Amino acid sequence: HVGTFENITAAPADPILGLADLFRADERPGKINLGIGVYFDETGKCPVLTSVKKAEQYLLENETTKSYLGIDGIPEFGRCTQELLFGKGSALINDKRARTAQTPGGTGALRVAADFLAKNTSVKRVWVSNPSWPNHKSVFNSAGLEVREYAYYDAENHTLDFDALINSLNEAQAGDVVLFHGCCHNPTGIDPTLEQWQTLAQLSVEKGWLPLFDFAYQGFARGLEEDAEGLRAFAAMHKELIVASSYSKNFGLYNERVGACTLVAADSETVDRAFSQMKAAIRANYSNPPAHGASVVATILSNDALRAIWEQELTDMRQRIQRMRQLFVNTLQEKGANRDFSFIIKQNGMFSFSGLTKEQVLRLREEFGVYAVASGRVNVAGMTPDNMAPLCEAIVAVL
Amino acid sequence: HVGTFENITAAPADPILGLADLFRADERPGKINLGIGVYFDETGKCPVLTSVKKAEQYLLENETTKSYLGIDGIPEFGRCTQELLFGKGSALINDKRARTAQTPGGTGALRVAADFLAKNTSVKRVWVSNPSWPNHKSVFNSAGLEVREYAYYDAENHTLDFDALINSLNEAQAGDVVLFHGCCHNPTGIDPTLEQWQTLAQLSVEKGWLPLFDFAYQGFARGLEEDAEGLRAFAAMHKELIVASSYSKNFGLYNERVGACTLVAADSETVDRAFSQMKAAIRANYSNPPAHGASVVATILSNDALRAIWEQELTDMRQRIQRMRQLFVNTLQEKGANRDFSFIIKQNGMFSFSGLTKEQVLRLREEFGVYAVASGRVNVAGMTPDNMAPLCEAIVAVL
Numbered sequence: 001h002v003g004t005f006e007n008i009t010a011a012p013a014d015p016i017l018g019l020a021d022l023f024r025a026d027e028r029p030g031k032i033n034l035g036i037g038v039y040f041d042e043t044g045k046c047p048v049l050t051s052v053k054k055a056e057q058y059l060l061e062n063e064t065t066k067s068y069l070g071i072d073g074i075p076e077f078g079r080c081t082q083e084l085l086f087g088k089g090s091a092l093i094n095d096k097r098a099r100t101a102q103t104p105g106g107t108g109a110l111r112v113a114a115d116f117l118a119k120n121t122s123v124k125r126v127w128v129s130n131p132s133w134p135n136h137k138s139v140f141n142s143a144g145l146e147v148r149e150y151a152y153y154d155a156e157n158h159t160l161d162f163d164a165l166i167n168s169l170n171e172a173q174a175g176d177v178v179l180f181h182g183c184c185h186n187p188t189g190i191d192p193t194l195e196q197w198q199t200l201a202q203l204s205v206e207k208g209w210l211p212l213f214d215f216a217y218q219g220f221a222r223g224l225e226e227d228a229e230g231l232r233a234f235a236a237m238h239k240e241l242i243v244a245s246s247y248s249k250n251f252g253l254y255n256e257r258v259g260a261c262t263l264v265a266a267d268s269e270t271v272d273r274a275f276s277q278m279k280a281a282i283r284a285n286y287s288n289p290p291a292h293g294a295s296v297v298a299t300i301l302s303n304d305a306l307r308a309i310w311e312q313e314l315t316d317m318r319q320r321i322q323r324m325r326q327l328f329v330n331t332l333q334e335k336g337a338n339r340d341f342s343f344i345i346k347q348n349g350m351f352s353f354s355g356l357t358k359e360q361v362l363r364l365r366e367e368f369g370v371y372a373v374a375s376g377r378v379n380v381a382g383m384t385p386d387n388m389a390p391l392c393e394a395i396v397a398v399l
Numbered sequence: 400h401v402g403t404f405e406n407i408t409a410a411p412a413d414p415i416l417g418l419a420d421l422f423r424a425d426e427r428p429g430k431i432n433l434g435i436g437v438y439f440d441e442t443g444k445c446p447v448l449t450s451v452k453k454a455e456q457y458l459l460e461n462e463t464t465k466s467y468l469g470i471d472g473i474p475e476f477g478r479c480t481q482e483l484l485f486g487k488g489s490a491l492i493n494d495k496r497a498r499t500a501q502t503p504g505g506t507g508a509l510r511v512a513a514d515f516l517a518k519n520t521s522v523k524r525v526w527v528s529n530p531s532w533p534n535h536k537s538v539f540n541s542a543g544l545e546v547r548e549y550a551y552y553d554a555e556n557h558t559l560d561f562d563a564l565i566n567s568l569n570e571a572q573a574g575d576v577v578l579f580h581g582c583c584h585n586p587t588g589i590d591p592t593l594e595q596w597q598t599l600a601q602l603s604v605e606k607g608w609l610p611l612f613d614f615a616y617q618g619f620a621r622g623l624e625e626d627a628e629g630l631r632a633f634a635a636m637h638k639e640l641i642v643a644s645s646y647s648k649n650f651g652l653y654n655e656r657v658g659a660c661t662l663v664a665a666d667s668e669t670v671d672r673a674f675s676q677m678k679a680a681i682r683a684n685y686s687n688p689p690a691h692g693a694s695v696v697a698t699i700l701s702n703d704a705l706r707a708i709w710e711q712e713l714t715d716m717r718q719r720i721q722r723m724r725q726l727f728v729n730t731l732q733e734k735g736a737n738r739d740f741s742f743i744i745k746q747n748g749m750f751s752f753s754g755l756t757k758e759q760v761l762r763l764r765e766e767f768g769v770y771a772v773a774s775g776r777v778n779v780a781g782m783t784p785d786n787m788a789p790l791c792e793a794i795v796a797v798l
């Protein structure tokens with residue numbers, strides 16, 4: 001017989017996760033990794049947080065079973081997630097308008113939302129910022145949804161092009177999904193102001209969009225509560241929305257796959273009805289979610305002494321990044337860059353859109369062992385005081 | 400505007416996992432849970448294995464990072480899985496014809512295979528046993544694949560209706576997928592003999608089927624190697640096959656979501672090419688897999704001392720279930736059943752396919768607080784010396 005796999009075409013490598021493979025194989029001792037969005041500390045390692053290690057030790061000594069969780073995961077994980085997103089006293093919570101499923105990462109939450117929408121509603125299109133996280137298109141296309149781009153980044157001025165964004169979104173119809181990053185836009189690090197978020201919320205209800213928030217960096221811009229201001233302005237006005245959140249980065253729990261998909265509807269009866277179909281879509285995907293990482297999150301957020309350790313550890317990560325942004329810009333000028341890079345200071349989170357071309361990024365890898373994403377996205381949290389000078393010498397050499 | 404979620408139709412509760420909510424709400428003293436397929440010990444609890452606690456302590460002491468795994472997970476986990484499935488000296492391993500992705504549970508492995516097949520092959524139809532695990536049809540339908548049933552169980556003689564199985568698969572075409580349970584058929588506990596496996600292996604190659612094995616109970620029928628004889632007879636003759644395996648039950652790691660999807664192609668170049676598309680399908684779903692559970696498994700299988708502990712714990716579980724089967728048949732007789740239940744002794748695995756009707760199952764629940772699946776599937780591994788007599792009195796009463 002002819003053979004079912006014989007004619008499969010090879011898939012291109014992932015623009016982000018393929019870099020990990022390339023970086024590992026490189027034998028040069030000076031190689032520098034500015035690709036994948038993980039946090040590195042001052043010594044260039046990706047550590048386990050102290051709050052996490054303490055929680056894991058608690059679990060090891062007190063866990064008595066690994067029996068299946070429910071489809072939607074650990075209840076306390078869901079309650080804690082809704083408080084973080086919407087705030088302790090939220091009317092969305094008092095009115096029982098929100099339901100949360102624990103998922104395997106924020107990616108898993110994005111795919112669950114996508115499958116749920118494609119199979120149970122009339123949604124056909126998802127609007128994504130230009131640029132955005134490259135895996136957004138893959139997730140939504142895989143669920144059967146069309147992806148369209150709205151304008152976002154002004155590459156000449158290194159700023160948000162708000163007029164262009166609104167103009168391009170006038171083409172989105174009622175019942176379309178519009179995706180927003182909650183904070184720390186990936187890859188640009190340029191977020192709307194509160195005033196701009198409020199304008200968008202007002203426009204969103206007027207046009208009948210279904211907001212979907214990808215919230216992977218709560219805490220990395222200004223603070224836990226501050227970073228949720230944009231989402232909360234939407235939640236005050238909308239009958240329906242979806243949040244896909246991740247604890248991969250703000251807890252350093254990347255490989256344990258800890259996220260949540262939160263559904264909001266006009267009332268309790270409607271959200272419970274919708275969530276019954278979200279559960280069915282989960283059952284048909286991975287059945288039920290992995291306990292270890294979510295148990296760690298729920299243990300920390302439920303315990304006042306552990307939470308305070310964690311919040312300080314998150315503030316320390318945010319502030320180290322801020323220090324590297326400033327050090328990066330100053331060192332570029334000292335190494336002979338005659339370009340202005342001060343826009344890097346105005347960007348939030350791990351990632352800076354550096355303005356380097358694909359050919360420059362390729363030279364950095366091949367000639368200098370400096371690994372960045374082909375789009376010019378650099379992970380500022382990969383920078384350390386020890387690698388800053390060789391990094392900047394390399395960038396100046398390709399300008 | 401109207402609202403995206405208002406036209407949604409509620410989904411029913413899962414026929415297996417929904418039982419937990421019903422059992423938890425029941426206030427009748429003496430209620431008995433024989434529903435979801437988890438192992439219980441003599442005390443009615445679902446314990447963590449000792450080998451697993453030992454491995455989790457090692458991981459707590461030696462993990463230095465939670466940085467993302469590769470898309471296909473822990474390399475050693477893949478190697479250990481292939482040896483368990485195919486045997487240490489397998490030609491499939493030496494010729495590098497097999498690639499394995501770590502997945503979230505066996506369900507995740509089935510879903511990844513479904514998505515991969517739908518988007519990269521001309522497969523349109525999956526054949527599943529009647530009866531089967533109810534989630535099989537949902538997983539394959541989630542990728543848009545038609546699911547057909549083949550005959551399997553002789554409900555009169557409580558045996559494999561092999562002639563009907565053969566005849567009912569007459570219309571399965573070249574390029575159709577045929578799903579086989581590797582051992583401990585769920586729910587019937589009736590498996591092909593080795594001669595029957597060999598007969599199916601030859602028919603499958605002559606007809607050009609793509610075999611997909613669901614392997615969730617390796618080690619619960621007779622033993623680790625013996626339970627793989629059927630798969631290995633297929634692997635000796637086929638150029639292509641897929642194995643979705645689970646460690647939920649044989650390691651007691653249910654809620655950590657530890658499984659594997661193994662692809663086999665005619666040669667190394669072909670399977671690598673196909674595997675690159677499986678990785679793309681994972682990236683667009685949950686991105687990369689959860690580390691904790693698979694690290695436990697890889698640790699135990701890689702250490703001769705821990706592996707010997709685990710193997711004994713698996714033998715212990717299998718033996719307790721066998722003693723409970725005998726006690727179940729004996730006690731039904733002493734409580735006055737006139738129906739002959741001795742066929743239950745011939746069934747493999749955790750379950751007894753009892754022959755009770757939906758009406759008798761509902762009556763057990765409402766009248767006696769005994770919880771089984773509406774198909775008549777009862778979890779023998781949930782029976783104990785302490786609950787056996789009340790259970791049997793309740794069954795005898797609804798007969």
Ligand SMILES: *Cc1c(COP(=O)(O)O)cnc(C)c1O
Nearest residue numbers: 105106107133186216246248686
């Ligand atoms: C990291 C990230 C994700 C994925 O988070 P995971 O928990 O690793 O799946 C999704 N969206 C954005 C914008 C991200 O930065």
Ligand SMILES: *Cc1c(COP(=O)(O)O)cnc(C)c1O
Nearest residue numbers: 287504505506532585615645647
């Ligand atoms: C348990 C089981 C599964 C799913 O296993 P998980 O690892 O819990 O996802 C799939 N198929 C069969 C036949 C099973 O018994």
